[PDB]
């Protein structure tokens, strides 16, 4: 029986790609697969784009049921002490938007094929999914994890060096993705238009809340804001602040962000070139 | 190609050092890259032991719950499992109870286990004393070691101890 060749499409989206592959592998007689022409970096961008579309859709419809007057995501109930220090390069910020957290905990790094760490929300996230295993959050994260596993099983199969090997795990990963997509697409379909706020990644943080933050918390915010194509009111607020900048500077000059992979040297440079701009 | 083939499992909380330990064993390097392992990863290391050539198929797992079903496949068929905690992280120590339960649930009944307290180079941040860990490990007939992936302490000894124990179970 001839093993089918997984190929990556002209510009087709992750879901179509999976639909395609699941079809090829469900064909009769197949008992192996050729992952030689699969570019894992491109597969990761492809999945990440889809995750981004989903996470964006969740925000627009406010599937999170976020009340306009809270400056915090719904994970707050599952986290104190709430250390204000950095945890594997990030500090807990209670003001993270749910869709950003969702993207953080599930985006596959095209270079390393791991996740860029977002440690302060791993436990509250897990805790949430336990109390609310049918929650929209739990469903999105589950679709997310499902997509990750497809890439995982392919990278595994793409290796060589083992016993045998063997496929049903891949087959399942593909079908589990489809299923979870069904539930996600169904949640999304129910349609209050979209509510906007005055920074990209966080709910509105007031001056008093912001002057209570540690340097690590503040630097975490700055590093996050640089992911946006335009300077934010929030990051400008912080860099404009003389007192806030002091905390930001001596955290930047620490060791808590050494291991960060989001172009940390370059971001530190942007932040400095932006303080000068603003004082 | 080999006399034996030992499947090894690294399990334990997120961020306690499983991927770092495995990197110190396989390549003798250490890096601080904040990258979380997704699902599983593996490495292969043929070692010679008491005259016999042993292949180590070592599985690095993810510690976070969404990946639990994905890692669980690897508990069955594992010859030895290393349960890892962070000596600066009381919670990750507490969770060793919960990891030993996943071993019951999914792994064979004769698996060799090893308890390992990582990041032991953080000496002023250590909240889990050696005695409390040792006593717990001893109560189970389970070996215990305090390792440092960063300063290369006991990392070799942990895997070689575990390979020796599995070989002895013949
Ligand atoms: N001081 C110290 N820090 C460590 C040690 N091992 C790991 N770390 C830190 O914890 C992180 C590594 O844990 P890692 O193995 O990658 O995560 P895991 O795969 O989920 O267990 C690194 O980024 C380090 O900052 C260690 O032996 N000593
Ligand atoms: Mg890991």
Please give the distance, rounded to the nearest whole angstrom, from the Cα atom of residue A193 to the centre of ligand 1: 44
Residues on chain A touching B70 (C-beta within 8 angstroms): 145, 149, 152
Whether chain B has a CB inside 8 Å of the CB on A259: the answer is yes
Q: Which atom of ligand 1 is nearest to the CA of B149?
A: 27
Ligand found nearest the CA of B34:
1
Nearest CA in chain A to B62: A114
Nearest-angstrom CA–CA distance, B71 and A142? 15
DSSP chain A: ----B----SS--HHHHHHHHHHHHTSTT----B-TT--HHHHHHHHHHHHHHHHHHHHHHTTT---TT--S-TTGGG--S--SSEETTEE--TTB-HHHHHHHTTPPPTTTSSEEP-GGGHHHHHHHHHH-TTSHHHHHHHHHHHHHHHHHHHHHHT---SS----HHHHHHHHHHHHHHHHHHHHHH--------SSSSB----HHHHTTS-HHHHHHHHHHHTTSSS--HHHHHHHTTTHHHHHHHHHHTSSTTTT--S-HHHHHHHHHHHHHHH-
CA–centroid distance for B118 within its chain = 10
Residues on chain B touching A51 (C-beta within 8 angstroms): none
Residue B132, CB-side half-sphere exposure with 13 Å CA sphere: 10
Domains of chain B: 1-170 (3.40.50.300)
Domains of chain A: 1-68+133-190 (1.20.120.1700), 69-132+191-279 (1.25.40.830)
Tokens encoding A197: 């706020």
Nearest CA in chain A to B33: A259
Which residue's alpha carbon is nearest to atom 17 within ligand 1? Answer: B15
Q: Is the dihedral of CA B123, B129, B135, B137 positive or negative?
A: negative
Ligand found nearest the CA of B149:
1
* B interface residues, A as partner, C-beta within 8 Å: 5, 14-15, 32-40, 44, 57, 64-67, 70, 73
Contact criterion met (CB below 8 Å) for B83 and B100: yes
Q: Which atom of ligand 1 is nearest to the CA of B14?
A: 20
Which residue's alpha carbon is nearest to atom 18 within ligand 1? Answer: B15
Nearest CA in chain A to B91: A123
**What Cα–Cα distance (Å) separates residue A60 from each residue in A67, A95, A199, B59, B111?**
13, 17, 15, 40, 50
Whether chain B has a CB inside 8 Å of the CB on A167: the answer is no
Surface-to-core class of residue A236, CB atoms within 10 Å of its CB (0-12 exposed, 13-18 middle, 19+ buried): middle
Closest by CA position to A15, among listed A41, A43, A35, A37: A43
**Tell me, what DSSP letter sits at residue B89?**
-
Rounded to a whole number of angstroms, the distance from the CA of B141 to the nearest CA of chain A is 31
């Amino acid at each position: 029986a001839t093993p089918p060749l997984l190929q990556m499409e002209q510009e087709q989206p992750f879901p179509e790609l999976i639909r395609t592959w699941a079809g090829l592998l469900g064909q009769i007689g197949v008992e192996s697969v050729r992952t030689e022409e699969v570019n894992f970096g491109q597969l990761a961008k492809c999945f990440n784009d889809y995750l981004n579309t989903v996470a964006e859709h969740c925000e627009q419809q406010n599937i999170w049921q976020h009340k306009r007057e809270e400056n915090h995501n719904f994970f707050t109930a599952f986290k104190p002490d709430a250390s204000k220090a950095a945890l594997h390069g990030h500090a807990y910020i209670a003001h993270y938007k749910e869709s950003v957290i969702l993207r953080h905990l599930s985006i596959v790094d095209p270079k390393t094929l791991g996740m860029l760490r977002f440690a302060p929300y791993e436990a509250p996230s897990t805790d949430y999914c336990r109390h609310f295993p049918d929650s929209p959050w739990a469903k999105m994260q589950r679709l997310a994890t499902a997509g990750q596993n497809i890439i995982l099983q392919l990278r595994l199969i793409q290796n060589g060096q083992m016993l045998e090997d063997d496929l049903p795990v891949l087959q399942k990963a593909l079908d589990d993705f489809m299923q979870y997509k069904t539930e996600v697409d169904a949640l999304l379909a129910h349609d209050t238009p979209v509510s906007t706020h005055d920074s990209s990644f966080f709910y509105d943080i007031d001056e008093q809340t912001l002057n209570a933050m540690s340097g690590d918390q503040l630097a975490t915010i700055c590093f996050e804001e640089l992911n946006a194509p335009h300077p934010s009111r929030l990051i400008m607020r912080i860099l404009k602040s003389d007192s806030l900048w002091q905390e930001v500077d001596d955290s930047l000059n620490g060791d808590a962000f050494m291991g960060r992979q989001d172009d940390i040297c370059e971001k530190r440079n942007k932040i400095c070139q932006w303080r000068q701009l603003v004082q | 190609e080999y006399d034996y083939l030992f499947k090894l499992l690294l399990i334990g909380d997120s961020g306690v050092g499983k991927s770092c330990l495995l990197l110190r064993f396989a390549d003798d390097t250490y890096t601080e890259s904040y990258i979380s392992t997704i699902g599983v990863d593996f490495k292969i290391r043929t070692i010679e032991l008491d005259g016999k050539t042993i292949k180590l198929q070592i599985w690095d797992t993810a510690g976070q719950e969404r990946f639990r079903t994905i890692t669980s496949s690897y508990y069955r068929g594992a010859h030895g499992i290393i349960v890892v905690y962070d000596v600066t992280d009381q919670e990750s120590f507490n969770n060793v109870k919960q990891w030993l339960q996943e071993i019951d649930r999914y792994a064979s009944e004769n698996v060799n286990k090893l308890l390992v307290g990582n990041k032991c180079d953080l000496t002023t941040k250590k909240v889990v004393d050696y005695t409390t860990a040792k006593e717990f490990a001893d109560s189970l007939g389970i070996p215990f070691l305090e390792t440092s992936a960063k300063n290369a302490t006991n990392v070799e000894q942990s895997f070689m101890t575990m390979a020796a124990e599995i070989k002895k179970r013949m």
